[PDB]
Design a binder for this molecule. Structure first.
Ligand SMILES: Nc1ncnc2c1ncn2[C@@H]1O[C@H](COP(=O)(O)CP(=O)(O)OP(=O)(O)O)[C@@H](O)[C@H]1O
Ligand SMILES: Nc1nc2ncc(CO)nc2c(=O)[nH]1
Ligand SMILES: [Cl-]
Ligand SMILES: [Mg+2]
Ligand SMILES: [Mg+2]
Length: 146
């Protein structure tokens, strides 16, 4: 299953943070990275944001245990300076105590949507909404690469 994960860091010099995170993402068992977006310096200091397409045989809650582990192990300041958010998990819709998939706010965030669109321009959400339409409709300003 293709999972799309948002990576965010508020570090002033967060490149290494994000590289640490990407390495660990690639080291998730039963998974491998398909594509990584450009890095984007986005208004909140400022964030470094990226999107990752991750092929995985893991159930969504398994994937979350791993991203949460990575936040603790690789976060310069634990989960607060490294944020790994599951945007989409294939076409699954999940509304559990631990997991709301698609991410409950991604449709409001250029810093999630534009990197996603870079790597998955033909993406359609479970409800049938198309990523291109949302960017069209909201007309989010294009982001600036890191
Ligand atoms: N799609 C999703 N991806 C990652 N965590 C999710 C999630 N949906 C729900 N969560 C839950 O979100 C909880 C808190 O994670 P935080 O990283 O502190 C939220 P955040 O990313 O800081 O804010 P945000 O959701 O506005 O982006 C986790 O304990 C987890 O159970
Ligand atoms: N630019 C930017 N702002 C954010 N604000 C809140 C949150 C909460 O996770 N994330 C972000 C983010 O990744 N980028
Ligand atoms: Cl949806
Ligand atoms: Mg977040
Ligand atoms: Mg988070």
């Amino acid at each position: 299953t293709v999972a799309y994960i948002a990576i965010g860091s508020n570090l002033a010099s967060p490149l290494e943070q994000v590289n640490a995170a990407l390495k660990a993402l690639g080291d998730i068992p039963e998974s491998h990275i398909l594509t990584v977006s450009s890095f984007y310096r986005t208004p909140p200091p400022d964030y470094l944001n990226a999107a990752v397409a991750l092929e995985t045989s893991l159930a969504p809650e398994e994937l979350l245990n791993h991203t949460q582990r990575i936040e603790l192990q690789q976060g310069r300041g634990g989960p607060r300076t490294l944020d790994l958010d599951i945007m989409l998990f294939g076409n699954e819709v999940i509304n559990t105590e631990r997991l709301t998939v698609p991410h409950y706010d991604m449709k409001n965030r250029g810093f999630m949507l534009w990197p996603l669109f870079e790597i998955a321009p033909e993406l359609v959400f479970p409800d049938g909404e198309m990523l291109r339409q949302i960017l069209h409709t909201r007309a989010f300003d294009k982001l600036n690469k890191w």
